[PDB]
C-alpha cells in the first residue's frame, strides 16, 4: 500500500493552505484513522493532528483535519515562517499496521 | 321504571333542605343514584353518586361536607340533604339512575351512564 | 377532566342535518353520553357510549368520534328536536358535563 | 517522561543490528504499543513494527522476514534487532509510543486487565530523539 | 415453561396462622385446590405454591449462616407464572385497577361451609376497590358455585 | 357480611409475606424517597431517590471487586439482576459504583427514551408495591416515566422495620428475574 | 410461563373491518372464543390476542414519540406462545406444509349462523394448499362442532 | 361453494398485519435480494443479500456509537437482537460496522457449520415469511443453509410500500426474541 | 412458553425395539396418548416427544460426518417442560425419591389389553423403590382406569 | 404375581436413550471420579475429579482459540453452556484452559459462597443421575456441597462404552440449557 | 369397486382422443383419479392426477397443455383428452383411483398410492 | 425424483425366494409402492408404504427398506408370480415409476 | 385388629428360636409387620420390617443373617427366626403392625409408625 | 440416627402436670411417635406425627415440637399414667427408640 501526497506545497504568509493525502480505491479499508505529523529539519517527527481536527496539546488551532472517502486534508490557516517543515500522513490499516505517506515540503 | 321526586319547596336561606326521590319498577339494590344540579339558565352540574347496594358514596369535590347523601332500601328512597343555603344554590335537583362501574380480574372495566331521570325538584331561596 | 361544546348555539331551519361537537380535556375512550333537555323537562339519555343508541330513540340521532373529539348528528331534524343538548364523560370521577348547546 | 535511544553507530554489512530504547517516567506495562520508525536519509518515514506489553508483535510485511522487536518490563525498555543488514538500511531510527487498539490484544486482556480507558488516538503520541545507523 | 410444584397436605390445603395477617388457621377443600393444578391465571395458586415451597425448604433443607438466594433463583419458574405478574403490571400501566398480592376475597357457604377459590382484591388509586364496584364478579362466582354444587 | 343470594357470605384473607424472608428477598416502601429490599433478617438494600449525590467520581470497579471476594453474594446478585434488567442502557458514564471494604454502593444519575426512563422503569418494577408514589405525573407516552429527583442511590443496610406505606412482597424481584437480559445492546462483536 | 392476556368484548369477539383486508366486520361467538383461553396450540388465538393488545394500547396509552419497541419486548410472552412459531419453523425446515399466519378458514352454519374457531390455511412451496388436500381436517372440524351442537 | 355435510359452508378470512405497525416491527420481503423490517410508519431496516460489499474496513465500533447517542433506539435494539441470536459466532472479523452520524450499517462477509450458515439461519428466522426464495438449492445436511451471495448488508431506510412478495408480519421478530442469547460462545472467564 | 410438538403415527403411539432396552414393540392406545397433549407434568410424554423428534429428524433431514447440536438447542423448548426436570432436581435435593427418566411402569388390563399412561419408577439412594413403597399410586391409577372404563 | 383389583397387571419398560446419539449429547458415569458427555459416536468430553492437575499456568486463550477455528463446535458449545451456568462465578484465576491445536482442556481449582460449591453444583446438574457418588454425603447449608478432590478437569475424548454406573441420558444437558445465563454477575457497566 | 375404461380406439394421427372411465362401487367424490400411460414394450409413465371433489389438477411436467382431465360427478366419470397425436402416443391408458394427499396443522402428511386400477384402453395411430 | 431397478431379470425356478431391489435419486421416507403386472393385464398394487401389504395379497410377498434403498422378497415362488414388477415413489410430485424388471 | 403372638419358649443356647404373630381384624396384605426386641429392664430395640404385600424386607444393620423374617398370607402369620442364641439374646419380642411408607411422583412421602402391638413373647436361655 | 430423652426419671406427685423431652441426632421433621408402656404390658401408641393423638387416647396427653426437639405434656396425671414413656423416630431407616423414661 502507498499514500500519495504532493511533492511540495507553497503559500504566502498569513493565508490558508491545504495538503491532500490520497489512497487508491482498491486500498480502501487500509485507509483509516488518518493522522498528520510534522518533522522540522534534523528533528524527530511531532504529532500535530489525529483522527480529524483533534490536536494533542498546546499546538494552535490553526491545524485542522478532514477525511472524505479516499482522501484526507490537513489545513494550516494563518501560515507563518516557522511552519516550513515536512508533513506526513499516516493511516492505520485493517491489518494492524501503519502506512506512511510520501510527505510534503511546505515552503513559505 | 321512572323515578318520582319529592316536590317543589322553598325556604329562607340558611336552613337545610331534604329532597327525596323514590324508585319503582326495578330492583332498587342493583343500581345506585346520582344527583345533578342545574342553576336557572346554567348547565348541569354533578353532585355525587350513592350506591344502593351498601351506601358507598362518591362526592363532588366542591360538595363534600356541605351535602349528605343517604339511601333506604325498605322504601326505595334516595335522599339529598343540604345544610347551608346561599343565594347561588337556588336550582333544580335531578335524581338520576346509574349502574355501578364494574371491574374484574379477567375482564375490562364497564362504565355506565345515567339511564333514567326523575322530574326535577326546584329549590329557591 | 373538563369538556367543552364548540357550537354553543345553532340557528338552523328544520329539514337539514345538524352537527354538534364535544371536546374533552383528556382521553375518554368511547365513554361519552349525549342527553337532550326540552324546556321545562328533565334531560333524557339519547346516546350512551360513543355510538350506541338508547332504547326508544329514533335513528335520526347518531354519535361518532373517540379519544378527545366526539360528534352528534341529527339527519332529518323536526319541530320536536328543538332542545338543549348536553355532553357528559363517564370515563372517570368526578363526572363532567358540557356547557350545553341550543338548537333553534 | 522520555524515550532514549542506544546502539552502535557503524555496522559491518551482512551482520545483525541491535538498538535499545529505554523509557523514563512512562511505564511500558501501563499500556500503549511501543514501536520503531525508520527514515532513510532524505527519504520518507517508514514504519518497522510494534510490540505490546503482552508480547505480541506487528511487523511491516516488507520487513517481516528479517526484523524482531523485543520487550523487557523489568528494566522497562524495548529493543530492535535487524538480521542481514544491507547497505540500504543506513537510516535514522526512532522509538515511538502509539495508542492504537488491536482487537486480538483487547479481547485477550479482559479478565486480568479489566477494561481500558476507551481513549484511543491510533497515533504515535511520543517519539524518541532518534539515532543514526550507518552501514 | 409451565410450573410443576404440587401442593402438599383431605386433598385440600391449610394456611396456618403464620401465613395470615391477623387471622387464625384457614383450610380450603379439595375442589378449590384442584383448580390450582390446571389454571394458568390464578394469583392465589401462585402465592400458595410460594408459601408451600418456603415451608418445605425450611423443613427439609438445613439452614444456617448467610441467607442464600440461589435456591429461589433456580426454582422460581417451577412455582409461579411470571406472565401473571406481567399482566398485572400491564394493567397497572394502562390505568385499570390492578392486583397487588396482599388481599383476597372468597365466598363461603353459610350452612355447608363450602368455599370458593379465593380471588385477589383489586386496588385502584392505592386503595382497595369496594364491593359495589365488583359485585358482578361476586355474583358470577356464586353462579359457578351453585352450578358446581348441582353436579 | 353481606349475603349473596341469601346463601353465600363474602369473606377476606390477607397474606403475611414477612415469613418468606428465609428463601426470597422481600421489597417494600417506607415513603416517597426510601424503599427497601431485605434478605434474611440481617442485610438488605436501600433504594433512595434524592437530589444529593454520594459518589462524585466516575469509576465503577467490578473486576477489582470480584477479585477481592468481600461483598455479600446475595446483594451482589440482586444488583446484577437490577442492572441487567434496564432496557436500552447505553450511557455508562451515568452509573458510578463503590465497593471498598466489601460494601456495595451504586449511584444512577437521572439528570423520554433516555437513561432516566429505563432506570425508573426498572426501579418501579423492582419495588412494585408503593413505588407509584414518586410517579410525579411523568406520563407522556407509552410509559415514559419521569421524576423530579436527580439521583437513585442503592446502598446496603442492616435489617430494620423499614416500610410503612406498603407491605413486604417478593413479586417485584421475582418479576425482574425473568426479564433479566432481554433488553441489552451489543457492545462488542465477540460476546 | 404461559400467556395471560384475556380478550375484551355477548362474550364473543368481533374483528373490525380494519383488522381484515377486503372484508367487513366478523363476529365469533362465546363457544369459539372460550377455546382461546385454554388451548396452547392455536395460531388464530395468539394473533387475536396480538390485535387486542394493539387496540388496547392505542386506546389507553399515549403515542407521541417515534414509536417504541420496549412495550412489545416486555409483554410479548403474555400474549403469544413462542413455541408455536418454533413448531411452524421446524415444519418449514422438514419440507412440510406450514402456517405463515396470514389466511385462516372456518366452517359457518348456513341457517343457525354459528361458527367454528378458525384454523390457519397451510402453505406449501410458496402457495396455499387447496381444499382437496386438507378436506379430512375440515370434515373433522365439522364432526367436532356437530358434537358440540349436540350438547 | 360446496357444503360440508350439507349444513356448513367453508369461509375464509385473512388478517391485516399492517394495522399493528405502531406497536411492533413488521417484516416482509420485496424480491429475491431485498427484505425489510419497518418500525412505525417512519423508519425501518433494509436487509439485502448483496454480492458486492459496501464496508471495506474490519472495524466495528459499538462503544463509541453508544457514547455518541445519536441512532434510533428501536433499530439498535433490532440489530442487537439479530446479532445476539446468531448461533455459534466466533469469527469477529466477519462483521463490519459503520454508525457515524446516527446511521446504522452492518455487513457480514458470509465467505458447512461456518459463519455464513449461522448468519443465514438468523436472517431466515428474522424475515421468516418469504425468505425461502433467496435460500437457493444450497440447503443441505440438517439445516446447513448456503447461499450464492457474498455479503449481507443491514442499513436503515425510510418507510415505503416495499414488500410485494410477502405480506408484512411480526412473527419473525417475535420469534427471535426468545432465542436471543441461547447460542453464544464464552470469550472470557468473567463475563 | 409451552410445548407444541404433536406425536406422529389409531391415534396411539408405538415404541419400536430400538427405543427400548431388552424389549419389542410396545403400543399405547389413543386414550393414553391424548393425555400427553394437555398435561404439563408427565415425564413419559416428554420422553415420547424427544424420541419422536429424533425419529423425524433422522428420517427427513440429512446427516454428515460430524454431529451438530444446534437443532436440539433450538427445538428443545417445543418438546419438553424444563420445569419438570427442575422439579425432579428439587426432589433429589430434599432427600425424596425422584425420577431419572430411565424406567417407567404402567397398568395392563389382562383381557381387554387397554393400558394407562406409564409413570416414572422412583429411585432413592441409587436403587429403584420396591412396589410396596408406591402401592397407593398404583391403586389410584387402577381406580382412574375403572372410572374411565365406566364412562 | 401381583394383579391390582384382580384385573390389572403391573408392567415396566425401560428407555434406550443411546439411540438419541445423533441429535443430543448424552451424559454418563463410570465411577466416582470419571464421567463423560458423548456427542455422536465419535467424540465427547471427559469430566474427572482429581488431586492431580494437568495445567499449571493461569491462562485461558479463549479469544485466540476462537481466532484459530480448529476445535469441534459441539464441544465448545457444551463447555460454554457449562461455564455460563455456574452461579456467582467471580474468581477468574480459579479456571485454567488449554486449546492448543484444537484440543479442549479446562481445569477448575476446587481448593457457602465458594467457587468450588458453584462449580460442583453445575457439575452435578450436567452429569445428573450418577454424579451423587461424588457428593461426599455432606450438606453444610441449603445446597452447599463439598468434595475432597480439588481439581475438576474437562478434556476431549473419543467415544467408548463408559456407562458402568449410570445410563446415558440427555436430561442434564437439556436442564442446563434453561439455566444458562440466569445467575451471572456484571463485570462491566455496559455489557 | 372397479373402473371400466370405455373401449379401444384407433384413429389417424393429428386428431384428439377422448377416453373415459366410469367409477362405481364407492363414493366417487372422495377419491381422485390418476392417469398412467404404458407405451408398447416400455414401462409405466405418469400423466396427471385430478381430484373428484372439486376438479383440482396436478399435471405431469411434459404433458402440460398437451392433455386435459375432467370429471363429472353426475355421471360418476373421469375423462382424459389428448389434443395432438403422434406416432409415439400409441400406448395403453389406465385410470387408477387415488386418495388425495392429506395435510393438517396438528398431524403429519398422509400420502397415498393407486389403490384400484381399471383395464387399459389401447390407442393406436 | 428418478428411481431405477438394478437386476432387471430374475430367471429362476419355482419354489425358491426372489429378491428385487429399488434405488431412488433422493430421500423417499417409506413412501414406496410395489405393483405387479401379469402380461395382458392391468397393474395391481402389491405393497403400499415401505412394508405394508395390500388387501388380498398372499403373505409370500414382503417389502422392506426406507430412505433410498428398498427391497421386495418372495419366499415361496409359484407359477403365477412370473410377472413384471414396478417400483413407484409417492413422496412428491410428479409421481415416478421404475423401469421395471421381468421375473422369468 | 389385635395381634396374637406365640407362647413362652425356653431352650438351650445354640439352637434356633421361632416366634410367630398371627394377625386378625384387618386386611393382612395391606400392612407390613415390624419386630422389636426388649432386653429385661432395657429399652426397646428395632430388628426389622417385612411387608405382607410382596415380602420386601428391611433388616437391622446388626441383625442380618442372625434373624430371619417371613410372612405367610394363607394363614395370616408373620414369623421370626433367631439362628444362634446367646445370653445377650434373652429378651421379650414384640410384633407390631406398620403400614408401608408411601411415595408418589406428585405428592410427598407419607411415613407411618407402629399402630397396634402384640403381646410379647419371652425367650430365655 | 440416635435420640436420647434428657430427664430419664420424674419422681413427681400425682395430680400435677409432667413434661418429657426428646432430642434426636439428625433432623426428623414432625415424624415422632410417643409410646406408653405399663409395667408388664406391651407398649401402646400414644402420639403419632408431631402432635396428633392416637384413637382412643385421652386429651390429657399432648405433643409438641419438631426438627430436633420434641416435648410430651401430661396435664392432669392419674394413677394409671405412671408408666415408661418411649420416643421413636420413623423419618429414616432403621427405626430407633430412646433409652426411655420412668414416671413414678
Ligand atoms: C397492596 O395495596 C394496599 C392498598 O394500597 C396496601 O395496603 C396498605 O398497606 C400499608 C402497609 O401496611 C398500610 O399502612 C399501615 O397502616 C397502619 C394503620 O394505619 C393507621 O395507623 C395508625 C393508627 O393505628 C395511624 O397513626 C396511622 O397514621 C394510620 O392512620 C399502620 O399502623 C402501619 O404502620 C405500622 O406498621 C409498620 C410495619 O409494621 C411499621 O413500620 C409502623 O411503624 C407501624 O408500626 C407500629 O405498630 C406496630 C404494631 O402493628 C408496632 O410493632 C410498631 O412498633 C409501631 O408502633 C402501616 O403504615 C395501609 O393502611 C394499607 N392500606 C392503604 C389503603 O394504604 C398494601 O400494602 C399493598 N400490598 C403490597 C404487597 O404492596
Q: Which domains does chain L have, with CATH numbers?
A: 3-102 (2.60.40.10)
Q: How far is CA M114 from the centre of its chain?
A: 11
Gyration radius from chain A CA atoms: 13
Give the Cα separation of N44 and M44 in Å (integer). 13
Question: Does the beta carbon of I60 lie under 8 angstroms from any beta carbon of chain L?
Answer: yes
DSSP category for residue D104: H
Position in ligand 1 atom list of the atom nearest CA F164: 58
- Three-state SS letters, G23-70: CCCEEECHHHHHHHHCCCCCHHHHHHHHHHHHHHHHHHCCCCCCCCCH
**Angle subtended at Cα E60 by Cα E58 and Cα E66, rounded to the nearest 5 degrees:** 50
User: Is H67 in CB contact (< 8 Å) with chain F?
Assistant: yes
Give the CA count within 13 Å in the CB-facing half-sphere of J103. Answer: 12
Q: Do E40 and G4 touch (CB under 8 A)?
A: yes
Q: Hunting for cell 538500511 — which residue is that?
A: D89
Q: What are phi and psi of J123, to 5 degrees?
A: -65, -45
Nearest CA to J129 among J163, J83, J174, J172?
J172
Taking one residue from E and the other from F, the number of pairs with CB-CB distance under 8 angstroms is 141
Q: Which residue, J166, J185, J135, J190, is CA-closest to J38?
A: J166
For strand B9-10 and strand B121-124, is the pairing parallel, antiparallel, or unpaired? parallel
Beta strand K9-10 pairing with K121-124: parallel
Residue pointed to by grid coordinates 458402568: J164
Rounded Cα gap, residues J40 and J20, in angstroms: 9
Rounded to the nearest angstrom, the distance between the alpha carbon of E87 and the centre of ligand 1 is 27
Query: Do the chains contact at E8 and M106, CB–CB below 8 Å?
Result: no
Domain count along chain A = 1
How far apart, in whole angstroms, are the C-alpha atoms of residue D134 and residue A68? Answer: 40
Residue whose C-alpha is closest to residue L34's, from L75, L94, L77, L88: L88
Nearest CA to ligand 1 atom 17: F164
Cα-to-chain-centroid distance, residue G49? 8
What is residue L40's three-state secondary structure? coil
Domain span at residue A66 reads 3-106
Domain ranges for chain B: 3-123
> Strand H8-14 and strand G103-109: pairing?
antiparallel
Backbone angles phi, psi at M17, to 5 degrees: -110, 130
Inform me whether the C-beta atom of residue A14 falls under 8 Å from chain H C-beta atoms: no
Q: Coil, strand, or helix at residue J4?
A: strand
The Cα of I61 is separated from the nearest Cα of chain L by a number of Å equal to 9
Contact G7, G33 (CB under 8 A): yes
Identify the CA nearest to G103 among candidates G122, G88, G84.
Answer: G122
Residues 6+ apart with CB under 8 A from H96: H55, H56, H57, H58, H59, H60, H106, H107, H109
- How many other CB atoms are there within 10 angstroms of residue A76's CB atom? 24
Q: Nearest CA to D102 among D122, D76, D124?
A: D122
Q: Which residues of H are less than 8 Å from J73 in CB distance?
A: 88, 113
Among positive and negative, which fits the CA dihedral N42, N48, N51, N55?
Answer: negative
Candidate of F20, F28, F164 to mutate for ligand 1, largest count of ligand atoms within 8 Å of Cβ = F164
Contact between C42 and B118 using a beta-carbon 8 Å cutoff: yes
Q: Which of F78, F70, F87, F84 is nearest to F46 (CA)?
A: F78
Terminal alpha carbon distance of chain G: 33
| Cα–Cα distance list, F52 to B69, F110, I149 (Å) | 49, 12, 74
Nearest chain B residue to E41 by CA: give it.
B106
The DSSP code for J79 is H
From the list L41, L48, L99, the residue facing K43 with the nearest CB is L99
Q: Which helix H or strand E contains I90, and what residues bound it?
A: helix I82-93
Instruction: Evaluate the omega torsion of the peptide bond into residue N86 and state whether it is cis, within 30 degrees of 0.
Output: no
J58 close to F (CB below 8 A): no
Q: Whose CA is nearest to atom 9 of ligand 1?
A: F166
HSE, side-chain direction, 13 A CA sphere, residue G95: 15
Which residues 73-112 of chain H have a CB within 8 Å of chain F? 73, 76-77, 79-80, 83-84, 89-90, 92, 95
* For helices E82-94 and G43-60, angle between their N-to-C axes, nearest 10 degrees: 30
Eight-class DSSP state of K1 = -
- F97's CB contacts (< 8 A; 6+ apart) are F55, F59, F60, F61, F62, F65, F104, F105, F106, F107, J189
Dist. CA G125–CA G92, nearest whole Å:
10
Helix segments in chain J, DSSP class H: 62-67, 73-84, 115-126, 171-176
CA atoms of I4 and H186, how far apart (whole Å): 31
Q: Which residue bears the cell 455479503?
A: H151
Looking from the CA of N56 toward its CB, the CA atoms found within 13 Å total 4
| First-to-final CA distance of chain D | 31
Tell me which residue has its CA closest to atom 14 in ligand 1.
F165
- CA of F166 relative to ligand 1 center, distance in Å: 7
* Residue of F126, F127, F161, F175 to mutate, ligand 1, most atoms within 8 A of C-beta: F161
Domains of chain H: which residue ranges?
23-176
Nearest CA to CA, how far is E108 from chain N (Å)?
28
E74 and N CB contact within 8 Å: no
Residues contacting residue B19 through CB under 8 Å, at least 6 positions apart:
B5, B6, B9, B79, B80, B81, B82, B93, B95, B121, B123
The DSSP H or E segment spanning D2 is: strand D2-6
Pick the closest to residue F153 from F62, F32, F26, F34 (CA basis). Answer: F34
- Cα separation of E23 and E104, whole Å? 13
Neighbours of chain I (3+ CB pairs under 8 A): E, G, H, J, K, L, M
Asked if E98 and E128 count as a contact pair (C-beta separation under 8 A), the reply is no
Distance CA I103, CA I81 (A): 18
CA angle A30, A31, A32 (to 5 degrees): 105
E94-130 CB burial, b ≥16 within 10 A, e <16: eebbbbbbbbbbbbeeeeeebbbbbbbbbbeeeebee
Cβ contacts from D onto F, under 8 A: 7
What one-character-per-residue DSSP string does chain E give? -----------SEEE-TTSBSS---EEE-HHHHHGGGT-SS-HHHHHHHHHHHHHHHHHHS---SS--SHHHHHSSTTT--HHHHHHHHHHHHHTS-B--SSEEEEEEESSS--BPPPEEPPEETTEEPPGGGSHHHHHHHHHHHHHHHH-
I63 → closest Cβ in H88, H141, H178: H141
Phi/psi class of residue G92: alpha, beta or left (left: φ > 0; alpha: ψ in -120 to 50)? alpha
- Cα(C48)–Cα(D89) distance, rounded to whole angstroms? 96
Ligand 1 nearest atom to the CA of residue F162, by list position? 41
Residues 6+ apart with CB under 8 A from A48: A36, A37, A38, A55, A56, A59, A63, A74, A87
The alpha carbon of E25 and the centre of ligand 1 are apart by a number of angstroms equal to 22
H27 strand-pairing partners:
H37, H169
Order across the sheet with H3-4: list the strands. G119-120, G103-109, H8-14, H3-4
- Pair J44, J127: CB distance under 8 Å: no
Rounded CA separation D16/K8 (Å) = 102
| Beta bridge mates, D21 | D5, D78
Residue with cell 424388471: L101
I26-53 in b/e burial notation, b at 16+ Cβ within 10 A?
A: bebbeebbeebeeebbbbbbbbbbbbbb
Do N and F count as touching (3 or more CB pairs closer than 8 A)?
Answer: no
Please answer yes or no on whether F80 and J188 come within 8 Å at the CB atom: no
Q: CA Rg, chain H, in Å?
A: 19
CB pair distance less than 8 Å for D123 and A47: yes
Reported structure resolution in angstroms: 2.8
How far apart are alpha carbons K67 and K75 in whole angstroms?
A: 21
Nearest CA in chain J to H112: J73
Q: In CATH, which of 2.60.40.10, 3.40.50.11720, 3.10.129.10, 3.50.50.60 is domain B3-123?
A: 2.60.40.10
- Per 3-state DSSP, chain I is made up of helix, strand and coil in percentages (nearest 5) of 45, 15, 40
* F3-4 and F8-14 strand pairing: antiparallel
CB-CB neighbors (< 8 A) of I60 in chain L: 27, 29
Residues of chain A positioned with their CB less than 8 A from the CB of D130? 44
Looking at the complex, report in whole angstroms how far the Cα of residue M15 sits from the nearest Cα belonging to chain N. Answer: 26
Nearest CA to ligand 1 atom 63: E127
Q: Does E57 touch chain J (CB under 8 A)?
A: yes
Residue L37, CA distances (Å) to I151, K20, L43 in order: 51, 22, 4
For F36, the grid coordinates are: 427497601
Give the H or E element holding residue D35: strand D33-39
F164 Cα–ligand 1 center, Å: 5
Cα of H158 vs its chain's centroid, Å: 16
Q: Please give the grid coordinates belonging to residue G69.
A: 419497541
Residues with CB under 6 A from ligand 1: E 100-102, 123, 126-128; F 129-130, 161, 164-167, 169
Amino acid at each position: 500500500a502507498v499514500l500519495t501526497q504532493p511533492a511540495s506545497v507553497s503559500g504566502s504568509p498569513g493565508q490558508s493552505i491545504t495538503i491532500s493525502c490520497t489512497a487508491a480505491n482498491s486500498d480502501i479499508g487500509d485507509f483509516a484513522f488518518v493522522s498528520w505529523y510534522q518533522q522540522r529539519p534534523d528533528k524527530a517527527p511531532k504529532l500535530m493532528v489525529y483522527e480529524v481536527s483533534s490536536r494533542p496539546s498546546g499546538v494552535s488551532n490553526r491545524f485542522s483535519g478532514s477525511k472524505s472517502g479516499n482522501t484526507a486534508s490537513l489545513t494550516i490557516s494563518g501560515l507563518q515562517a516557522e511552519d516550513e517543515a515536512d508533513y506526513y500522513c499516516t493511516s492505520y490499516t485493517s491489518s494492524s499496521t501503519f502506512v506512511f505517506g510520501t510527505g510534503t515540503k511546505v515552503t513559505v | 321504571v321512572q323515578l318520582v321526586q319529592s316536590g317543589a319547596e322553598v325556604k329562607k336561606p340558611g336552613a337545610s333542605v331534604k329532597v327525596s326521590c323514590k324508585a319503582s319498577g326495578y330492583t332498587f339494590t342493583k343500581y345506585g343514584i346520582s344527583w345533578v344540579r342545574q342553576a336557572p339558565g346554567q348547565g348541569l352540574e354533578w353532585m355525587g353518586w350513592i350506591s344502593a347496594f351498601n351506601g358507598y358514596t362518591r362526592y363532588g369535590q366542591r360538595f363534600q361536607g356541605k351535602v349528605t347523601m343517604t339511601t333506604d332500601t325498605s322504601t326505595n328512597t334516595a335522599s339529598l340533604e343540604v345544610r347551608t343555603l346561599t343565594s347561588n344554590d337556588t336550582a333544580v335537583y335531578y335524581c338520576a339512575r346509574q349502574y355501578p362501574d364494574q371491574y374484574s380480574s379477567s375482564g375490562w372495566p364497564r362504565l355506565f351512564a345515567m339511564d333514567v331521570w326523575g322530574q326535577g325538584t326546584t329549590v329557591t331561596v | 377532566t373538563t369538556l367543552t361544546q364548540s357550537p354553543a348555539t345553532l340557528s338552523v331551519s328544520p329539514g337539514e342535518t345538524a352537527t354538534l361537537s364535544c371536546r374533552a380535556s383528556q382521553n375518554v375512550i368511547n365513554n361519552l353520553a349525549w342527553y337532550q333537555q326540552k324546556p321545562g323537562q328533565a334531560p333524557r339519555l339519547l346516546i350512551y357510549g360513543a355510538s350506541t343508541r338508547a332504547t326508544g330513540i329514533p335513528a335520526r340521532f347518531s354519535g361518532s368520534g373517540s379519544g378527545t373529539e366526539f360528534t352528534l348528528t341529527i339527519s332529518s331534524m323536526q319541530s320536536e328536536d328543538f332542545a338543549v343538548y348536553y355532553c357528559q364523560q363517564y370515563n372517570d370521577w368526578p363526572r363532567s358535563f358540557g356547557q350545553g348547546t341550543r338548537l333553534d | 517522561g522520555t524515550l532514549r535511544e542506544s546502539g552502535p553507530g557503524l555496522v559491518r554489512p551482512s551482520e545483525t543490528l541491535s538498538l535499545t530504547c529505554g523509557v523514563s517516567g512512562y511505564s511500558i506495562s501501563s499500556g500503549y504499543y511501543w514501536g520503531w520508525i525508520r527514515q532513510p536519509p532524505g527519504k520518507g518515514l517508514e514504519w518497522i513494527g510494534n510490540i505490546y506489553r503482552s508480547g505480541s508483535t506487528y511487523y511491516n510485511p516488507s520487513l517481516k522476514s528479517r526484523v524482531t522487536v523485543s520487550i523487557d518490563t523489568s528494566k522497562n525498555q524495548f529493543s530492535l534487532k535487524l538480521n542481514s543488514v544491507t547497505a540500504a538500511d543506513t537510516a535514522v531510527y526512532y522509538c515511538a509510543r502509539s495508542g492504537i487498539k488491536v482487537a486480538d490484544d483487547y479481547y485477550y486482556e479482559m479478565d486480568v486487565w479489566g477494561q481500558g480507558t476507551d481513549d484511543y488516538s491510533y497515533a504515535m503520541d511520543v517519539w524518541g530523539q532518534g539515532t543514526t545507523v550507518t552501514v | 415453561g409451565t410450573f410443576t410444584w404440587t401442593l402438599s397436605d383431605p386433598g385440600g390445603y391449610c394456611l396456618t396462622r403464620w401465613m395470615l395477617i391477623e387471622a387464625e388457621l384457614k383450610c380450603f377443600g379439595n375442589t378449590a385446590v384442584a383448580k390450582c393444578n390446571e389454571k394458568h391465571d390464578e394469583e392465589f395458586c401462585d402465592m400458595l405454591r410460594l408459601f408451600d415451597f418456603n415451608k418445605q425448604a425450611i423443613q427439609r433443607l438445613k439452614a444456617e449462616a448467610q441467607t442464600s438466594i440461589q435456591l429461589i433463583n433456580k426454582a422460581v419458574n417451577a412455582l409461579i407464572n411470571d406472565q401473571l405478574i406481567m399482566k398485572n403490571h400491564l394493567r397497572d400501566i394502562m390505568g385499570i385497577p390492578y392486583c397487588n398480592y396482599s388481599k383476597y376475597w372468597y365466598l363461603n357457604h353459610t350452612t355447608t361451609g363450602r368455599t370458593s377459590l379465593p380471588k385477589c382484591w383489586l386496588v385502584s388509586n392505592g386503595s382497595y376497590l369496594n364491593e359495589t364496584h365488583f359485585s358482578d364478579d361476586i355474583e358470577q362466582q356464586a353462579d359457578n358455585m351453585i352450578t358446581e354444587m348441582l353436579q | 357480611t353481606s349475603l349473596y343470594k341469601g346463601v353465600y357470605e363474602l369473606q377476606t384473607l390477607e397474606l403475611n409475606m414477612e415469613t418468606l424472608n428465609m428463601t426470597m428477598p422481600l421489597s417494600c416502601t417506607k415513603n416517597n424517597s426510601h424503599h427497601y429490599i431485605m434478605v434474611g433478617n440481617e442485610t438488605g438494600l436501600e433504594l433512595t431517590l434524592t437530589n444529593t449525590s454520594i459518589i462524585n467520581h466516575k469509576f465503577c470497579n467490578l473486576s477489582d471487586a470480584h477479585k477481592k471476594n468481600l461483598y455479600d453474594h446475595a446483594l451482589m446478585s440482586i444488583i446484577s439482576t437490577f442492572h441487567l434488567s434496564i432496557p436500552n442502557f447505553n450511557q455508562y458514564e451515568a452509573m458510578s459504583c463503590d465497593f471498598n471494604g466489601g460494601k456495595i454502593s451504586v449511584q444512577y444519575n437521572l439528570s423520554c427514551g433516555t437513561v432516566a426512563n429505563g432506570v425508573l422503569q426498572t426501579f418501579m418494577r423492582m419495588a412494585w408495591g408503593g413505588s407509584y408514589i414518586a410517579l410525579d405525573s411523568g406520563r407522556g407516552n407509552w410509559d415514559c416515566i419521569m421524576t423530579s429527583y436527580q439521583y437513585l442511590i442503592i446502598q446496603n443496610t442492616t435489617w430494620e422495620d423499614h416500610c410503612q406505606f406498603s407491605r413486604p412482597s417478593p413479586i417485584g424481584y421475582l418479576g425482574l428475574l425473568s426479564q433479566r437480559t432481554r433488553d441489552i445492546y451489543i457492545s462488542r462483536r465477540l460476546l
